[PDB]
Structure 1
């Protein structure tokens, strides 16, 4: 199907998903000198205290930690957003080498990985409806650099052995996503898309300025996952990132001077 290989990777996706060449595709390079400070942007409101994680799933392109989104338990509000967006899942994109892995770039710099906390706009009732709307999703993107370990990531790292291959899932309750956030909620924001097929143009991107640091051992454990299913030839799940796409008629806004 689509993937990240030589014959089915990002440069092939437009053949099945013509919106890949659309007007608001993601990710993009964030040119920090060209981003415009907008003093009218509100602080983000991240309300994760009642979050209910349920499960972790290897879907063959990343792993998703999924949450109960049937009530307003973990929500993102404020910032550029109107209304309330519910956390449905988070996942990461990462590299085969510490010098690559992020989807967004900052002044062309690539980070080792990028966390996506995915939220949907409650006025659309469910995630499947929301992805059909230009303001249907808000994805909070957080860069990962390699250095000190991130203690709040370790429970994720340690369960990965149980979901090595595509289609495997494991119970993953009581995980607190607040342990994945940096100190500052300063952010850049722009209208964009899902970064994997179907590449729908439904995302308000909110990318935090401050990266989190994770250890080399933590990211090494991401790289032991597999894209394939069990009993299929082993292909390490690495370099599951889409490169930067043209900014076209968009302006990136910054919440900070």
Structure 2
């Protein structure tokens, strides 16, 4: 640890030294890492990957959202959970965050068939374990965001909040909203890809069961741009928050499956 981890854009846009992704520590240099490219036609169908059950996702709340220095993060505080989805247990929702750029063809961490989307939203959940840490301790739901001209009304509480948390360690309260307001129609979430991997920031622990849904969220270009326009990596506000994306990792001998 000669300096704090950063994204490539941070090193490029500031003179202050920081560790770019290819130099990250902890478990980041191991071999079941994320994100990956998914060749959709090569992922095998597994019949056991059934529909998800969301609990607490329809409920209107006033979520707390904060700039943690490398993303914007809603604190979910177990107020929601998931089961199904071919998962081994229910998982409790901890936080929701995003990764983005300011060009429509980049911003996502994963790629489908070599295409990056304009953003990627991660909902982070924790395993309800039994008595017998594991490979699937964390379930992250990943949604790709496609830029367009459709105004997503569901996103507007989040987008309006961004103005209030431009600097790291700032928090605010969003207007009344549900998690489903942020997602595609539930019927469209039957198609997803599944693999085992890591967290995409240090320490990059290899304890994540990944789900990447095929159906993108549609967001207006300018709702996407609001992220890089309103947020900063630093209190000095010298580097607009964008390209908070880990580069693609090698699948190696792992297998990707789909519903």
| Structure 1 position 124, deviation (Å) | 7.4
Partner of 1:181: 183
Find the residue that maps to 2:41 and give its secondary structure.
Answer: coil
Conservation of the 8 A alpha-carbon contact between 2:63 and 2:74 = yes
Aligned-pair Cα RMSD in Å? 1.7
Find the residue that maps to 1:21 and give its secondary structure.
Answer: coil
Out of 62, 65, 83, the residue aligned to residue 56 of structure 1 is 65
Partner of 2:42: 34
Partner of 1:129: none
Conservation of the 8 A alpha-carbon contact between 1:54 and 1:68 = no
Give the Cα separation in 2 of the matches to 1:54 and 1:98.
Answer: 28
Aligned residues: 241
Give the Cα separation in 1 of the matches to 2:6 and 2:126.
Answer: 24
Task: Decide whether aligned partners of structure 1 residues 196 and 53 sit closer, same or farther in structure 2, where only a CA change above 3 A counts.
Answer: farther
Give the Cα separation in 2 of the matches to 1:62 and 1:138.
Answer: 19
Conservation of the 8 A alpha-carbon contact between 2:167 and 2:237 = no
Task: Decide whether aligned partners of structure 1 residues 53 and 85 sit closer, same or farther in structure 2, where only a CA change above 3 A counts.
Answer: farther
Partner of 1:200: 205
Cα offsets for 1:151-180 (capped at 9, x unmatched): 111100001010001111112364301011
Find the residue that maps to 1:238 and give its secondary structure.
Answer: coil
Give the Cα separation in 2 of the matches to 1:63 and 1:119.
Answer: 17
Counterpart mapping for 1:218-233 below 5 A: 218-224=223-229, 225-229=231-235, 232-233=236-237
Give the Cα separation in 2 of the matches to 1:205 and 1:191.
Answer: 6
Conservation of the 8 A alpha-carbon contact between 1:38 and 1:253 = yes
Give the 4+ runs in structure 1 shifted more than 4 A. Answer: 50-53
| Structure 1 position 77, deviation (Å) | 0.6
Unaligned 5+ segments in structure 2 are: 12-17
Find the residue that maps to 1:11 and give its secondary structure.
Answer: helix
**What TM-score do the two structures reach when normalised by structure 1?**
0.89
Give the Cα separation in 1 of the matches to 2:70 and 2:100.
Answer: 11
Conservation of the 8 A alpha-carbon contact between 1:51 and 1:67 = no
Find the residue that maps to 1:155 and give its secondary structure.
Answer: helix
Out of 148, 168, 171, the residue aligned to residue 169 of structure 1 is 171
Conservation of the 8 A alpha-carbon contact between 1:44 and 1:78 = yes
Partner of 1:83: 89
Task: Decide whether aligned partners of structure 1 residues 10 and 82 sit closer, same or farther in structure 2, where only a CA change above 3 A counts.
Answer: same
Counterpart mapping for 1:11-160 below 5 A: 11-13=22-24, 16-17=25-26, 19-47=27-55, 48-50=57-59, 52=61, 54-69=63-78, 73-123=79-129, 132-147=133-148, 148-160=150-162
Task: Decide whether aligned partners of structure 1 residues 93 and 61 sit closer, same or farther in structure 2, where only a CA change above 3 A counts.
Answer: same
Partner of 2:5: 2
Task: Decide whether aligned partners of structure 1 residues 233 and 74 sit closer, same or farther in structure 2, where only a CA change above 3 A counts.
Answer: closer
Conservation of the 8 A alpha-carbon contact between 2:161 and 2:173 = no
Find the residue that maps to 2:222 and give its secondary structure.
Answer: helix
Conservation of the 8 A alpha-carbon contact between 1:52 and 1:68 = no
Cα offsets for 1:9-67 (capped at 9, x unmatched): 21121xx22x2121211000011111111122221212223475541110100010112
